[PDB]
Amino acid sequence: MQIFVKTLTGKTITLEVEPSDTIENVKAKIQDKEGIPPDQQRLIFAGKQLEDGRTLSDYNIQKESTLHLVLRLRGG
């Protein structure tokens, strides 16, 4: 499937994943598309924030669905 990660600049990067794909691996595809390391990058969906150990399905996201990408400076 595919999902549309809107970046914070007003961009939308579509990426191809599974509902069972984890947020960590989604952010790693953002690193492929945008260049941002996952530990430094955050993910929102529908005015809520996601965690690396969760999945699109955990947030009930499906195909052709939109996400939000922020920069969060650091993590470790």
């Binding site: 809107k6 970046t7 914070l8 600049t9 007003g10 945008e34 941002i36 955050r42 929102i44 005015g47 809520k48 924030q49 939000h68 922020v70 920069l71 969060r72 400076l73 650091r74």
Partner: protein, 32 residues
């Protein structure tokens, strides 16, 4: 203040939840 790197723009940053914006602007300002 509604951006820091070129990766940020007020429109999406307003669609954004306030508490995550709070993290962002405060940290952006701090590392700034």
């Amino acid at each position: 203040g509604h951006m820091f790197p070129s990766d940020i723009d007020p429109q999406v940053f307003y669609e954004l939840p306030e508490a995550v914006q709070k993290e962002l602007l405060a940290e952006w300002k701090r590392t700034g």
